[PDB]
Amino acid sequence: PMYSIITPNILRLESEETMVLEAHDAQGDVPVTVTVHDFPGKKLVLSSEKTVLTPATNHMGNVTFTIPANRGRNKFVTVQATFGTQVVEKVVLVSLQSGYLFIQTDKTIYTPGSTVLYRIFTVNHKLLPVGRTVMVNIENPEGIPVKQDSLSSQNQLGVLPLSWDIPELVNMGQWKIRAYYENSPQQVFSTEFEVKEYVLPSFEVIVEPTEKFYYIYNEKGLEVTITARFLYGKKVEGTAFVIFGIQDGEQRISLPESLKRIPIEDGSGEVVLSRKVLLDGVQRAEDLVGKSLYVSATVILHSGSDMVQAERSGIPIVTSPYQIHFTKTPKYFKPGMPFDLMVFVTNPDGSPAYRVPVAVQGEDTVQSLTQGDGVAKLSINTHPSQKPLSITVRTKKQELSEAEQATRTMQALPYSTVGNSNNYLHLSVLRTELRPGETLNVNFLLRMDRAHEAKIRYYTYLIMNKGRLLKAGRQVREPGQDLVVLPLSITTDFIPSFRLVAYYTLIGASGQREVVADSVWVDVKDSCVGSLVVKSGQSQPVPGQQMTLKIEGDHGARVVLVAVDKGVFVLNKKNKLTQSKIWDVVEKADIGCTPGSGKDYAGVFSDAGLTFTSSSGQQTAQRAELQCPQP
């Protein structure tokens, strides 16, 4: 008769959270009352919420509770669950985090004497609109507040529009808008804008290297095309001045011998950084690997009436066109069982390399192609030895030579069993592009001895998304079954990513209860939960011409608009609001800290962002840290 409780590692105020309650090896109806208390003493916060675990639904259910704001450093709560007479208590961390603030300015860059128009979008941890009070500051390059607001988004549908007049006399540079929720002043959301004196250019200059990197042994050097066209579409005739340089983190080295003056004919020009000029500029060749090149082009129209300067920086100097990353791969393995590697391969700029063969070294020629998002699944079998597993994955892209192919090594440690018992759980999915509205199969793979295998009649699983329990159930199992498959329906609720953490429990050899756990992290394709599309009716228009704007979106949605002259982005294209910048911020906020698995059962639950506490003593350690560990 073991009673367990599962909640998030970190809890949130005035947000609904789930507590999954389980009776293992018990009969009849078991009354449960769940109370939340303050830690250093007894005050009782919220409490209530009543359930009865019935034998019909298999002694598993949940309570849905909401912690109110009561009133330095870490705030904890003692959470009690009474299974009949049995008290199971767990101290849990509490976040003051109210959600997310995203900030939009109308432009990237402003002159003195103009208006900065901006809005703040106030959303909760689910990316839904909330009404809270928000403190917003505009600061100068020196960081001095120049405008200071405190407002409420209550009843405003999550949108706060504000404006600021830049004075004629103002310091030029990188200005900032910093914004925080009133309740959570530790967590500041910022955006940036430039203040400069300028006039709009009439054309843009694109600077493009033929490869997005420089291979150090390439005799051709670095080839760049310069394209210039007017903002209205036509091709530019002029002259470009082009200069290359080197960058080693903060430091720039200009190579003056690289300076070239070329014609821009039909909107296009060609320029090369020679290998000799590059090397003569640094007074060895490999030592440049890890550094980067930049290229600065200045285009003057034949009229001489307009001139545009552009830069392309961050051209990595490299010995391989690919990088292998093991950051989506569990760093712990289950001896005896398969070990899955989510290999992530990128181009040297950080963009995911698609359609690239990767293979493990040793069990070599297996091969697997990376997907759209540049990941490949590779599975190796492990022998039942408690020994640090070293893994080397290499690129096997043909057309590349052996030296050109990428290489990376990782180490995974063995998942240590409860009492040197050799009971393991292992979870597995396919790595394909997962969109909402699809079904995903979760494989449960069991490892224990034939004599003890029959005891396990189910696995409990848990879905964690955006810091909270999304869905929890049971996956049933009959004796003799190695694999049982769960068909998990994927909805828009699963969007950015999610963790699946499963366990089974039993009373094994010599009287002692045991919990065996595994976890897997799963990506979900980025989109909006809903939809939003802007288009014209029909379709060039003439200045002052009326036209129809057509906006397709969700019913009852508030839509906020801007129109910016593309001449503005030619001067500055930094800091622009996009849907995927939003998701990245959502992902940085994940309370689960690893790609999956763990040191032991407690280590599994903890790293996936969950507490575990049983009636018979087995438990996750206390988490007293609001951020993930540093590597």
Binding site: M337, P338, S379, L446, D449
Partner: peptide, 13 residues
């Protein structure tokens, strides 16, 4: 493809 044990459909070898 397999789990080192002496039961189940996915035994090694």
């Amino acid at each position: 493809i397999c789990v080192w044990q002496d039961w189940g459909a996915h035994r090694c070898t």
